[PDB]
Amino acid sequence: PFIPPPQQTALTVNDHDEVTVWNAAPCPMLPRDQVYVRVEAVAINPSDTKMRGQFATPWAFLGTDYAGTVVAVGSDVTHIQVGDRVYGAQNEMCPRTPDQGAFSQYTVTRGRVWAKIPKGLSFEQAAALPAGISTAGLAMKLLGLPLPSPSADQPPTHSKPVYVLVYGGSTATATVTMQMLRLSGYIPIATCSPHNFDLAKSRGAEEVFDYRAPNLAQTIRTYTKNNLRYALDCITNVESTTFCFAAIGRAGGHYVSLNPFPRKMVTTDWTLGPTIFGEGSTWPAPYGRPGSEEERQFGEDLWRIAGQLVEDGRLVHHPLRVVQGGFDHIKQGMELVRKGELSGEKLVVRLE
Ligand SMILES: C/C=C/C(=O)SCCNC(=O)CCNC(=O)[C@H](O)C(C)(C)COP(=O)(O)OP(=O)(O)OC[C@H]1O[C@@H](n2cnc3c(N)ncnc32)[C@H](OP(=O)(O)O)[C@@H]1O
């Protein structure tokens, strides 16, 4: 049986709320239904930068998005060989599993929220995808929109065009969501900054608008025949919620946000990330919820679908900004992300 290394490097937060390169971190045990991954590349997400204060578990590993090489295979796992390449998501800073996080030299795969990297994709391209895939699926689920068929030789047809507003169409989440929406037969319309217009259109937006434009909500209401029933808010602040409520049609609509938030006929939801694992959250406030087998199966189904889409080139990664380096480079990348210094790109670290 496989024996994990006695120590490794991982990124964590210490007992003084500081992001820390930890050079004596433990290695996880190998679950019988998972595989053991030597991490080759990771992506940085805003969620990583927010794991602080009450949100941090000291000495628990940071990071969601990883891609690496399989070094050991759990005894109950089929269809994966030692030396295969995989990509997937981890559930960062879960006090029950503090030795599992993407920002580590060695991790294990989690649930079935992972896949084999297609032959034509690099570690960096693959690492850019997992939180995107996962978030896009949770949002479509919450909006009440069906997932794409991995078959189906092309999108369902609708009665009339069914628009979906995506506020923040240059975000990492939006560029993956808009491809998926299109594959399901929906027509995304996006708002973002002018320099990311071409990116939004390349990723499935039928039209794209500058979110700063005066009375843009009237423009959108006109465009959608005053019957916009779906708004996906990828920005999630006071202004984006106001805009989305204004753009939704006179007969009502559904607003889904990627974070919690503090007129009639609008239902509202927001995506809780660990939900993709069928895990819940131990956090208090609006976060804590029990896990569920239905949530687990959804996540597996999504990943089976999206895996095939990525494999056939029908779902593509957000543009990359690739850094070569070690764990301090992940730490610096987080700060860049936290400061909003990235536009239209995802920061990926290839671990050297
Ligand atoms: C395995 C994990 C699975 C999950 O489901 S995680 C669940 C989803 N939720 C969260 O992770 C919560 C924590 N995350 C956040 O709060 C993120 O910031 C969200 C999820 C809201 C967005 O992250 P994402 O990675 O999708 O976007 P990004 O960082 O790539 O987007 C940045 C872009 O956001 C845009 N932006 C930034 N501030 C903006 C503003 N005030 N107004 C309008 N747009 C704004 C601005 O775009 P341009 O205007 O075109 O340059 C900027 O480039």
Curated annotation (Swiss-Prot):
MF terms in GO: enoyl-[acyl-carrier-protein] reductase (NADH) activity; lovastatin nonaketide synthase activity; NADPH binding; oxidoreductase activity; oxidoreductase activity, acting on NAD(P)H; polyketide synthase activity
Uppermost EC category: transferase
Domain of life: Eukaryota
Binding-site list for NADP(+): 47-50, 170-173, 193-196, 211, 258-259, 271, 342-343
Catalytic activity from the UniProt record: holo-[lovastatin nonaketide synthase] + 9 malonyl-CoA + S-adenosyl-L-methionine + 11 NADPH + 19 H(+) = dihydromonacolin L-[lovastatin nonaketide synthase] + S-adenosyl-L-homocysteine + 9 CO2 + 11 NADP(+) + 9 CoA + 6 H2O
Pathway(s) served: Polyketide biosynthesis; lovastatin biosynthesis
InterPro entries (UniProt xref): ADH-like_N (IPR013154), GroES-like_sf (IPR011032), NAD(P)-bd_dom_sf (IPR036291), PKS_ER (IPR020843), Trans-enoyl_RdTase-like (IPR047122)
EC assignment: 2.3.1.161
Gene3D superfamilies named in the record: Medium-chain alcohol dehydrogenases, catalytic domain, NAD(P)-binding Rossmann-like Domain
Applications (biotechnology): Lovastatin acts as a hypolipidemic agent that works as inhibitor of (3S)-hydroxymethylglutaryl-coenzyme A (HMG-CoA) reductase (HMGR) which reduces HMG-CoA to mevalonate and is the key step in cholesterol biosynthesis. Lovastatin, simvastatin and related compounds are widely used to treat hypercholesteremia and reduce the risk of cardiovascular disease. Furthermore, statins such as lovastatin were found to be anticancer agents.
Disruption phenotype: Loss of lovastatin biosynthesis.
Effect of residue 134 to M: Reduces catalytic efficiency
Family statement: Belongs to the zinc-containing alcohol dehydrogenase family.
Name of protein: Lovastatin nonaketide synthase, enoyl reductase component lovC
Gene name of the encoded protein: lovC
